[PDB]
Amino acid sequence: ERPTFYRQELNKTIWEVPERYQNLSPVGAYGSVCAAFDTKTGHRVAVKKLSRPFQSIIHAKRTYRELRLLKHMKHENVIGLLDVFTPARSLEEFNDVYLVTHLMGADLNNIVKCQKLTDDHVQFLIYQILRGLKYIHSADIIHRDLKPSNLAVNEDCELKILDFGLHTDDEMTGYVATRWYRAPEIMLNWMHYNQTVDIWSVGCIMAELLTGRTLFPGTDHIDQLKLILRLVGTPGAELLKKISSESARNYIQSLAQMPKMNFANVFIGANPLAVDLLEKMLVLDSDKRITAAQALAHAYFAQYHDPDDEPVADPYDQSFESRDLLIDEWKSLTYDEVISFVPPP
Ligand SMILES: N#Cc1ccc(CNC(=O)N2CCOCC2)cc1
Ligand SMILES: [Cl-]
Ligand SMILES: [Cl-]
Ligand SMILES: [Cl-]
Numbered sequence: 001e002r003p004t005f006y007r008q009e010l011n012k013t014i015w016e017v018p019e020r021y022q023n024l025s026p027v028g029a030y031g032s033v034c035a036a037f038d039t040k041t042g043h044r045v046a047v048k049k050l051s052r053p054f055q056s057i058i059h060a061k062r063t064y065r066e067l068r069l070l071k072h073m074k075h076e077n078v079i080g081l082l083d084v085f086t087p088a089r090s091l092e093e094f095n096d097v098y099l100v101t102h103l104m105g106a107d108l109n110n111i112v113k114c115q116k117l118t119d120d121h122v123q124f125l126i127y128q129i130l131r132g133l134k135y136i137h138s139a140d141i142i143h144r145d146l147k148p149s150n151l152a153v154n155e156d157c158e159l160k161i162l163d164f165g166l167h168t169d170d171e172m173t174g175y176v177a178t179r180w181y182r183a184p185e186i187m188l189n190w191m192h193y194n195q196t197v198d199i200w201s202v203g204c205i206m207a208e209l210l211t212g213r214t215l216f217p218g219t220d221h222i223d224q225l226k227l228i229l230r231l232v233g234t235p236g237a238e239l240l241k242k243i244s245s246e247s248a249r250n251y252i253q254s255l256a257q258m259p260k261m262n263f264a265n266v267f268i269g270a271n272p273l274a275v276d277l278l279e280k281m282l283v284l285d286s287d288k289r290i291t292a293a294q295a296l297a298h299a300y301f302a303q304y305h306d307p308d309d310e311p312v313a314d315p316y317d318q319s320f321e322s323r324d325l326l327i328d329e330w331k332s333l334t335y336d337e338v339i340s341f342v343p344p345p
């Protein structure tokens with residue numbers, strides 16, 4: 001059952017992989033990635049070698065979390081796991097983990113910069129994001145990091161969600177795309193967040209497809225909040241009650257009150273149905289945002305919506321997230337998941 005492995009050094013890194021993977025070529029702090037040709041399937045693939053996967057309890061649990069998530073995701077608009085392997089022949093010598101996925105070409109940033117998008121293109125792209133999100137949310141998973149660089153798109157306009165949130169303070173500081181798509185309640189730690197944060201990100205992405213430009217390109221956290229409240233209005237008393245951070249509540253009330261703007265005068269010339277959907281996604285109070293399942297039934301997607309072809313996920317057991325274990329116990333759980341992997345049909 002065990003394949004033969006061969007070794008090579010790629011940029012000061014020793015890679016040991018099954019013979020089926022050929023022509024390894026580096027492409028890019030949690031791991032290094034190589035493109036390769038998989039001779040068993042004929043696919044160009046990405047092979048990721050995890051860096052120090054078991055160096056601490058936090059790292060070991062993150063390794064297990066990533067492998068559990070990738071093994072569960074089986075949907076047309078979500079990245080799936082093609083293979084996982086280790087050169088180790090036993091738990092006692094187990095140290096390295098390699099993950100194999102489909103090699104992705106362009107992302108949605110490349111699309112918005114270099115392509116003139118019709119309203120039909122916007123409909124199809126956002127429809128596919130929402131179809132994948134309905135599946136992800138049905139398993140009680142929150143992506144947390146939806147942005148154009150985490151959305152792969154091919155020549156047929158077909159889309160896949162990748163790079164689930166599994167981010168440092170410095171990574172979120174300043175004029176950075178890593179913060180421009182985040183919901184205000186998570187950007188500013190207003191309250192315990194939930195899956196509705198992902199719908200805010202979809203609204204930001206859809207706006208950028210319609211205009212070609214970032215919706216909220218803030219130069220820091222506070223500048224970005226000011227841009228958001230200018231468009232959607234300052235909070236009312238109902239939402240202020242739900243901000244459990246007393247310090248954040250007090251800062252918000254320092255700001256002069258502003259009404260919600262007219263979205264037809266912001267998104268000039270857009271399909272009126274697109275404007276309506278944006279008003280339902282970009283709602284400050286997360287309790288009142290439209291959900292992915294509700295949005296698929298909005299009239300903007302009438303030509304693509306098929307309620308018999310929008311599937312949900314198998315149940316996903318996340319009880320490990322509240323479990324406290326030692327490094328070697330997380331490592332043993334990960335080893336079990338590596339050796340039990342069953343490849344897709
Ligand atoms: N380590 C581990 C571990 C692996 C599988 C299970 C349950 N079985 C399962 O999910 N599959 C789906 C794929 O086909 C076979 C059955 C439990 C623990
Ligand atoms: Cl092989
Ligand atoms: Cl895939
Ligand atoms: Cl190993």
Ligand SMILES: [Cl-]
Nearest residue numbers: 147148149177
């Ligand atoms: Cl991005």
Ligand SMILES: [Cl-]
Nearest residue numbers: 315316317318
């Ligand atoms: Cl499960």
Ligand SMILES: [Mg+2]
Nearest residue numbers: 149150162163
């Ligand atoms: Mg990414």
